[PDB]
Amino acid sequence: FGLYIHNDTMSALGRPQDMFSDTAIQLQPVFAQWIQNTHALAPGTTAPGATASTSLTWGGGDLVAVGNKVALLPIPLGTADFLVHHIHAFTIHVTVLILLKGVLFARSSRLIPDKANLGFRFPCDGPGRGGTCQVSAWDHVFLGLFWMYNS
Amino acid sequence: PKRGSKVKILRRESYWFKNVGSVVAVDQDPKTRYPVVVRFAKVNYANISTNNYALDEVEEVA
Amino acid sequence: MRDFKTYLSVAPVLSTLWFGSLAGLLIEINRFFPDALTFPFF
Amino acid sequence: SHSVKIYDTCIGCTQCVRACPTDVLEMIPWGGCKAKQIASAPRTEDCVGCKRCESACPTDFLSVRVYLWHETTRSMGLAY
Amino acid sequence: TRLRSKYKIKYQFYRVFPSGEVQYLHPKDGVYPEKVNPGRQGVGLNMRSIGKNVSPIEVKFTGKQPYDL
Amino acid sequence: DIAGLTPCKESKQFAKREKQALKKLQASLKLYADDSAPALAIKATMEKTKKRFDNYGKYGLLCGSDGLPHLIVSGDQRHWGEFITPGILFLYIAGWIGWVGRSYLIAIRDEKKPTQKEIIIDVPLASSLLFRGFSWPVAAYRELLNGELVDNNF
Amino acid sequence: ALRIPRFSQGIAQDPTTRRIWFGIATAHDFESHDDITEGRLYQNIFASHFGQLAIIFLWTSGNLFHVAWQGNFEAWVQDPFHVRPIAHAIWDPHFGQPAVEAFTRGGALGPVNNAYSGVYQWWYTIGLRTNEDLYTGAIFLLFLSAISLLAGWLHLQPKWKPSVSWFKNAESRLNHHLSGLFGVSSLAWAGHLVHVAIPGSRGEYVRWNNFLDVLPYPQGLGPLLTGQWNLYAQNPSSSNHLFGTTQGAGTAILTILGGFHPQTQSLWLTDVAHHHLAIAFLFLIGGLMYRTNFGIGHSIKYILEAHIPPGGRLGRGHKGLYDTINNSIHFQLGLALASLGVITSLVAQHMYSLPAYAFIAQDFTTQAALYTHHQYIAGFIMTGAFAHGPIFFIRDYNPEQNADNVLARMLEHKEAIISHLSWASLFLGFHTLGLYVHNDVMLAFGTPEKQILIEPIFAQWIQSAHGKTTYGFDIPLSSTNGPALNAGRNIWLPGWLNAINENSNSLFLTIGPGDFLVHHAIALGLHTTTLILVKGALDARGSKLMPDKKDFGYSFPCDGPGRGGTCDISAWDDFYLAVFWMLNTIGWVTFYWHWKHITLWRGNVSQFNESSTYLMGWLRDYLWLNSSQLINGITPLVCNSLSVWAWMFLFGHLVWATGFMFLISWRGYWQELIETLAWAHERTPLANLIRWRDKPVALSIVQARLVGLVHFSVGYIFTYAAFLIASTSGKF
Amino acid sequence: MINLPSLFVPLVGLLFPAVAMASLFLHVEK
Ligand code: CLA
Ligand SMILES: CC1=C(/C=C/C(C)=C/C=C\C(C)=C/C=C/C=C(C)/C=C/C=C(C)/C=C/C2=C(C)CCCC2(C)C)C(C)(C)CCC1
Ligand SMILES: CC1=C(C/C=C(\C)CCC[C@H](C)CCC[C@@H](C)CCCC(C)C)C(=O)c2ccccc2C1=O
Ligand code: SF4
Ligand code: SF4
Ligand code: SF4
């Protein structure tokens, strides 16, 4: 993510001159295709038949629709695509482990070591140990969510 | 004479307090500061309630 | 029946129930004198 | 380094202050309540605003809190 | 006390450090924090049996004067 | 007629932006107008409205530029009531709920032992516990200012 | 175990990151800091509160010095009005060659900032347009910079020491100290706004130099003395007289009847030269009210213990407060932000409502700039102004040096102010806000016809009597022949009418409907950004939850599970919450204004009037519209000159935002985690021989609410900040 | 001779604070 940021600092400040977009931090052909595409030689041989390219969304340029307006077509990716993504690619990291941190320690936490002594929810505990709160998984869950929503 | 009557609470210690009636029981055991055993039907952040009392207090009416 | 009385209550949906089966009436009245805009005395 | 100030009456327990984590608990014998018992801390140096010390500990007005100012690797807890 | 949900009993600890020594309540005498028995000291509580609590201005730059109690 | 704000009858805006605002829902010829539901986007409704057009009229509110009701009572001319003639009732409509509100409670220490004796409502209401609500003030509102308050009670 | 840093053992021996928070944070906390005699802090502040007087003075000796370099005044003299008011010169080695296409603006030659500090008029007014006759205010606010740090260096020396007594003395630091502080200050000022400004407004290189051989008034210095004056008000500078120029330049000096003339568009010069030369005597009586030595003039004291009236054939009996306001400093930071509270807000329109210089009423960029600002301190001074208002309570007040008199009483009957400042709001809760919503229902459900917009009937009275003659309502005074506007029908009361209403006047603005829909809303805000305060302050004396925060203090970080019935509990962290609802209550009254005002500067005043009385109006076309010039000076082509907030804004729109983790994400989730890897990097070789000087911990829960506050607000001071400016350099 | 005052900015941002986070690195080890 610390990466759209740059290309803002590099579109405002950052002069198309040189930065992270398609005719930019390009990445010429590209990004492929991947595969998908192959998903489009997939029915003409290779898994002998079936018909028409397993789902128009992937493939080459073998292209349809109907009803005046469009339907599905070769939705081609690239920059804008190994971008973003690596955010769902991110997020569903620091959205788990929140989760795992608070799923493992949860009953034995390396820092109130004995939990089963407050319940499932259980608020926090010490104003001592200089700031023990949001310890419960119940509250590891109380923000377990927020991010999902964010994700 | 007043054993557990409609008697008051009055010291810069309490929770309930002005809140009136009730001295339920009173002991005869001298040491402490806590002779005056109170129980009403209204409560602090416990549930059992009733905590004990005495001395610079009962400044009350009937 | 009685007597004021008292009489007998019920549980959690009474303050609620009040919203519906009676309070609606409102929308009848608010229909009856379509909108209000301001004071119609009689 | 434990704070601020915390106050009389309870003990015995069997229904109050039986659960500091980091000790900080004797019980002298002393004369006043309905058999003999006055307390805070034969200590306070192992604790730790383990402030579960009144939750178990009634007796009226503020009754446990923290104030660590210095705040110490003894009871700021962080070993490693 | 972990050793309280299988039945079990008599925990003891110690210290232990560079270079060994203390640091322990069971047993130094195992006085069970609960009990109460021998000679256990003062350090037991404000001349304020609390209620009397207020603005506490017995302070303006106390020295010697309280640091503390 | 005061501050502006004209009584509507010179029509300039309101009446027209009206016979505009409502009247392209009316161009709902864009469907088929005979009997419907499915459609009546055209013909009716305007009955409440346009067949209440020059109707609303009619007491002015001195609806104003924009051409819409700038609704005001403050205690001048006829208005001393566009919210006050319907301004008292509310006062009235509320705090005698206070009576039920009070005497409901002020029963919840009588017959003795209370609270959820608040959840089970002892169907608390229908008459004098409410049906005093009718008659409280200036005849007895100073249920306040003697033996009930003070307060004076026990 | 760790000896450093200083002030106390406590946290200076302490071994975690805290120190550095709890050094830096609590670093002007000295008044409870184990190292301080009855002087020490009283001693302290002095030098201290010179000290900055230093930089305030190097705040500007620069930025004065700064301009004439930079910008183009000595240039801009030739023609005075477009413009892109010019700030600094921006050495930003990241900016793409389109630095041309960047900020090659105004007089530039470099990507310069668009100045909005107003000032550029506040300097044009006093005197100068010759920057070769600047170079000097620089050198002057240096002639004050070094000079006054001897008040630093020196009067921070036991020798030419201070005392403490000297500090508690009341009737000298005050009485005597109105007379000097303000008083004289004006005169010469009051006179410079008289004898060096006039002669250019007449047009004349008066300078200093030729400093007596002027005589800008013909009849010397006579009638001042004597007892005859009106050969002064004599022929005001006149009617067209292109400003500070030739023709119509009607000599006079000390005037006081005319006001504006369209051209300056701004309170005309040396007719506030009589203003500053009057206020004076209104302390120079009440200014020799008391003392120095001499046995004549005031004590105060029975001012009270007698003068507790208004009060007492019962009541309250003051028998002196005093040994409280004079002993308790706080008060001196109880009411010196408290009341330099108000001023901020009564400067927050006087300053605009009628300007004061070289054209601003029709700049619509100060207003924009130089307003909200002067408002946000009427926040950030007005707020945190009762804070030093709990304080004395749990940290100056003794219930016994006082419990005769009002305060302690105020107190005895305090759980009342609380709960009528409350009913003051739950109501200013449903209403001003219930109504308000079909004013958002209908307006949606094709039904604006019917609508609850009840038009303000009251402010209404004012703004007419105080002159304003704009339609309807056959009453007296402003009759433009009326008997409050008579007996005085000439004094003060043609001119302040001559401009009273057509808006390039903004004077007493054009009252719309729903005008109170915010106005009300703004008499919601307050009543609910007090109570916080007047708890976070008042009962925050003790409470009954923990009837001893009295001991505890003002700034204790939350509480912990303590009998499930405790948490965030600092009287501080009620100032916290208090600073939320206040930025809410500014949250609002800067929408209005921008909506409003904005309206005008492009004629369209259905930018309200039509709209607001149903908030998408706000959202749609206060909020949604106008924009994407700003947020399209970024816009996958280029940047042009509105590039920044297009960055700054999303800044405010980030730097806001993450004042959130700290906030929603409380405390003992950080340590626990920041252990489970404060640890990982303690194992992993190569970067093993690295044991770190102190030892990484998470953050006191207070903090973890503070830097929630200075990422936030900083964010929030930001954007609107950049928007209110962005906006207008496109549209006006 | 001439061209500058950049002299300042590579300081005020580049070395100056490079020396702030340098000598109060500290405050601690001041
Ligand atoms: C508890 C209160 C305290 C008090 C006494 C005030 C008082 C004031 N604040 Mg204020 N304020 C406070 C706390 C307080 N504030 C806090 C905590 C905040 C933080 C949010 C603010 C934030 C704030 C802002 C942003 C502003 C103010 C402003 C004002 C002034 C507006 C003028 C006015 O009252 O219009 C109406 C007042 C009337 C008296 C007219 C109505 C008459 C009624 C009451 C009739 C009934 C009585 C009788 C017939 C009239 C006699 C009274 C007479 C004066 C007419 C006023 C001096 C404004 C300001 O400073 O001026 C530009 C504004 O800028 N305040
Ligand atoms: C005469 C007058 C007036 C008035 C004014 C004011 C504002 C004043 C103050 C006054 C006062 C001195 C006041 C006080 C009051 C009190 C009160 C008190 C109110 C009320 C109330 C309440 C709160 C109520 C309650 C209740 C009741 C009683 C009934 C119903 C139900 C209930 C129970 C809820 C006017 C306007 C005409 C003007 C001129 C003069
Ligand atoms: C992120 C976070 C942390 C962790 C804090 C961390 C990991 C801080 C690590 C330091 C960061 C990396 C510094 C970045 C910015 C600072 C250097 C700025 C201050 C510098 C000047 C004063 C010198 C908490 O401990 C916490 C506690 C309670 C509620 C919320 C939170 C919380 O949200
Ligand atoms: S703290 Fe607990 S054990 Fe000690 S006296 Fe109080 S209630 Fe008894
Ligand atoms: S802070 Fe509380 S829980 Fe911790 S040792 Fe001390 S009394 Fe016990
Ligand atoms: S801030 Fe933390 S320690 Fe304090 S009560 Fe809340 S959850 Fe517990």
**C&F contacts, CB < 8 Å:** 41
Three-state DSSP class for D3?
Answer: strand
C-alpha span between D42 and D38 (Å, rounded): 11
Q: How many domains does chain B have?
A: 1
Three-state DSSP class for C31?
Answer: helix
Query: Exposed/middle/buried for G391, CB within 10 Å: 0-12, 13-18, 19+?
Result: buried
Give residue C19 CA to ligand 6 midpoint distance, Å. 39
C-alpha span between G178 and G166 (Å, rounded): 17
CA distances from G392 to B53, E51, G96, G317, G400 (A): 31, 20, 56, 21, 14
| Contact map slice: D 9-68 vs G, CB within 8 A | 49, 51-52, 54-55, 61-67
C-alpha span between G507 and G464 (Å, rounded): 11
Q: Which domains does chain D have, with CATH numbers?
A: 1-80 (3.30.70.20)
> Tokens at residue F98, please?
């206070």
What's the number of CA atoms in the CB half-sphere (13 Å) around residue A113? Answer: 6
C-alpha span between F100 and F126 (Å, rounded): 10
Strand pairing partners for F64?
F68
- Identify the CA nearest to G130 among candidates G24, G194, G57, G205: G205
Indicate which of G551, G554, G682 best probes the interface with D, i.e. most D CBs within 10 Å of its own CB. G551
What's the number of CA atoms in the CB half-sphere (13 Å) around residue G695? Answer: 16
Strand pairing partners for D3?
D66
Residue B6 sits in a domain whose CATH number is 2.30.30.50
Check if the beta carbon of residue G467 is closer than 8 Å to that of residue G497.
Answer: yes
What would the DSSP string read from start to end of G263-297? TT-S--TTSSTTTTTTGGGTTSSSSSSS-SSSS-S
> Tokens at residue A73, please?
């077509």
Q: Which domains does chain G have, with CATH numbers?
A: 1-732 (1.20.1130.10)
Three-state DSSP class for G301?
Answer: helix
C-alpha span between A18 and G270 (Å, rounded): 58
Closest ligand relative to G568 C-alpha: 6
> Tokens at residue G65, please?
């010095």
C-alpha span between G194 and G202 (Å, rounded): 12
Judged by phi (left if over 0) then psi (alpha if -120 to 50, else beta), residue B58 lies in beta
Three-state DSSP class for F68?
Answer: strand
CATH class of the F1-154 domain in this structure: mainly alpha
Query: Exposed/middle/buried for D76, CB within 10 Å: 0-12, 13-18, 19+?
Result: buried
Check if the beta carbon of residue G111 is closer than 8 Å to that of residue G86.
Answer: no
Check if the beta carbon of residue G549 is closer than 8 Å to that of residue G568.
Answer: no
Please indicate whether residue G361, judged by its CB atom, sits closer than 6 Å to ligand 1: no
Strand (E) or helix (H) holding G588? helix G572-588
Check if the beta carbon of residue B13 is closer than 8 Å to that of residue E51.
Answer: yes
What's the number of CA atoms in the CB half-sphere (13 Å) around residue G41? Answer: 18
Please indicate whether residue G666, judged by its CB atom, sits closer than 6 Å to ligand 3: yes
* Angle at CA of residue D59, ends D54 and D64, nearest 5°: 35
C-alpha span between A39 and A57 (Å, rounded): 10
Q: Is the dihedral of CA F14, F18, F19, F20 positive or negative?
A: positive
Scanning the structure block, which residue is given the tokens 């309101």?
F14
> Which residues line the pocket of ligand 6, CB cutoff 6 A?
A 123-124, 127, 133; G 558-561, 566-568, 666-667, 701
- Identify the CA nearest to G329 among candidates G536, G554, G178, G168: G168
Give residue A58 CA to ligand 5 midpoint distance, Å. 64
Alpha-carbon Rg for chain G, nearest whole angstrom, is 29
Any A CB within 8 A of G555 CB: no
C-alpha span between G149 and G54 (Å, rounded): 7
C-alpha span between F82 and F59 (Å, rounded): 9
Instruction: Report whether G661 belongs to an annotated binding site.
Output: yes
Indicate which of E1, E17, E34, E58 best probes the interface with D, i.e. most D CBs within 10 Å of its own CB. E34
C-alpha span between H8 and C16 (Å, rounded): 71
End-to-end CA distance of chain B: give it in Å, rounded.
12
CB within 8 Å of G298: residues ≥ 6 apart? G171, G175, G289, G290, G291
> Tokens at residue F16, please?
């027209």
> Which residues line the pocket of ligand 2, CB cutoff 6 A?
F 95, 98, 141, 144
What's the number of CA atoms in the CB half-sphere (13 Å) around residue D79? Answer: 8
CB within 8 Å of G397: residues ≥ 6 apart? E55, E57, G324, G328, G407, G541
With an 8 Å Cβ cutoff, the interface of chain B facing chain E consists of: 11-14, 33
- Identify the CA nearest to D38 among candidates G551, E53, E43, E29: E43
Preceding omega of A28 cis (within 30 degrees of 0): no
Check if the beta carbon of residue G683 is closer than 8 Å to that of residue G717.
Answer: no
Q: Which residues of G touch D51 (CB under 8 A)?
A: 559-562
Scanning the structure block, which residue is given the tokens 């055991």?
B29
Kindly provide the resolution of this structure in angstroms, with one decimal.
Answer: 3.4
Q: Which residues of A are annotated as a binding site for [4Fe-4S] cluster?
A: 124, 133
Q: Is the dihedral of CA G480, G482, G484, G490 positive or negative?
A: positive
* Angle at CA of residue G86, ends G81 and G89, nearest 5°: 160
Check if the beta carbon of residue G19 is closer than 8 Å to that of residue G5.
Answer: yes
C-alpha span between B59 and B38 (Å, rounded): 15
Instruction: Report whether G670 belongs to an annotated binding site.
Output: yes
Scanning the structure block, which residue is given the tokens 């389109």?
G98
C-alpha span between G113 and G691 (Å, rounded): 47
Closest-CA distance of chain G to residue B1, Å: 32
CA distances from G288 to G181, G188, G297, G299, G332 (A): 13, 20, 7, 12, 22
Q: Which long-range contacts (CB under 8 A, 24 or more apart) does G523-527 make?
A: G523/G428, G524/G425, G524/G428, G524/G429, G524/G432, G524/G433, G524/G585, G525/G581, G525/G582, G525/G584, G525/G585, G525/G587, G525/G588, G525/G589, G526/G585, G527/G421, G527/G422, G527/G424, G527/G425, G527/G428
- Considering only the beta carbons, identify the residue of C12, C14, C38 that sits closest to F82: C38
C-alpha span between G93 and H10 (Å, rounded): 10
- Residue of minimum CA distance from atom 8 in ligand 5: D20
Contact B45 G563 (CB under 8 A): yes
C-alpha span between G278 and G182 (Å, rounded): 12
Which residues constitute the domain of residue B62? 1-62
Count of Cβ atoms closer than 10 Å to residue G116 Cβ? 21
Q: Which residues of B touch E52 (CB under 8 A)?
A: 12-13
Please indicate whether residue G21, judged by its CB atom, sits closer than 6 Å to ligand 3: no
Alpha-carbon Rg for chain E, nearest whole angstrom, is 20
Q: Which residues of A are annotated as a binding site?
A: 124, 133
The distance of Cα F142 from the centroid of its chain, to the nearest Å, equals: 27
CB within 8 Å of G323: residues ≥ 6 apart? G401
Check if the beta carbon of residue G577 is closer than 8 Å to that of residue G611.
Answer: no
C-alpha span between A82 and A38 (Å, rounded): 19
Q: Where are the beta strands (DSSP E) in G211-360?
A: 349-354
Check if the beta carbon of residue D64 is closer than 8 Å to that of residue G566.
Answer: no
Any D CB within 8 A of G565 CB: no
Check if the beta carbon of residue G252 is closer than 8 Å to that of residue G237.
Answer: yes
Q: Is the dihedral of CA G710, G714, G717, G719 positive or negative?
A: negative
- Identify the CA nearest to G561 among candidates D53, D69, A111, D39: D53
CB within 8 Å of B14: residues ≥ 6 apart? B53, D60, D61, E51
Any D CB within 8 A of G562 CB: yes
Scanning the structure block, which residue is given the tokens 């161009």?
F27
Q: Which residues of G touch B45 (CB under 8 A)?
A: 563-565
**F&G contacts, CB < 8 Å:** 46
CB within 8 Å of C8: residues ≥ 6 apart? F122, F123
Closest ligand relative to G562 C-alpha: 6
Chains D and A make contact, 3+ CB pairs within 8 Å: yes
| CATH dotted code for C12-36 | 1.20.5.510
> Which residues line the pocket of ligand 5, CB cutoff 6 A?
A 128; D 2, 20-22, 24, 47-53, 64
Helices (H) and strands (E) counted in chain H, each on its own, are 2, 0
Scanning the structure block, which residue is given the tokens 């399209």?
G632
Q: Is the dihedral of CA G134, G136, G138, G144 positive or negative?
A: negative
Helices G339-346 and G369-380: crossing angle in degrees, nearest 10, is 160
Check if the beta carbon of residue A126 is closer than 8 Å to that of residue D65.
Answer: no
CA distances from A74 to A27, A46, A59, A64, G300 (A): 19, 20, 6, 9, 88
CB within 8 Å of G13: residues ≥ 6 apart? D70, G1, G2, G3
Where are chain F's structural domains?
1-154
C-alpha span between G655 and G457 (Å, rounded): 43
Task: Identify the experimental approach.
Answer: X-ray
Chains C and A make contact, 3+ CB pairs within 8 Å: no
Closest ligand relative to G666 C-alpha: 3
C-alpha span between F84 and F67 (Å, rounded): 23
CA dihedral G577, G581, G584, G590 (to 10 degrees): -120
C-alpha span between E4 and E24 (Å, rounded): 20
Check if the beta carbon of residue G73 is closer than 8 Å to that of residue G131.
Answer: yes
Which amino acid, residue G708? Answer: G
- Considering only the beta carbons, identify the residue of D52, D69, D70 that sits closest to G561: D52
Check if the beta carbon of residue D67 is closer than 8 Å to that of residue G552.
Answer: yes
Please indicate whether residue G459, judged by its CB atom, sits closer than 6 Å to ligand 1: no
C-alpha span between G396 and H25 (Å, rounded): 37
Check if the beta carbon of residue B33 is closer than 8 Å to that of residue B55.
Answer: yes
C-alpha span between G537 and G389 (Å, rounded): 6
Task: List subunits contacting chain F, requiring 3 or more Cβ pairs under 8 Å.
Answer: C, G
Query: Exposed/middle/buried for G79, CB within 10 Å: 0-12, 13-18, 19+?
Result: exposed
Strand pairing partners for G489?
G492
Q: Is the dihedral of CA G574, G579, G582, G587 positive or negative?
A: negative
Indicate which of A129, A133, A135 best probes the interface with D, i.e. most D CBs within 10 Å of its own CB. A129
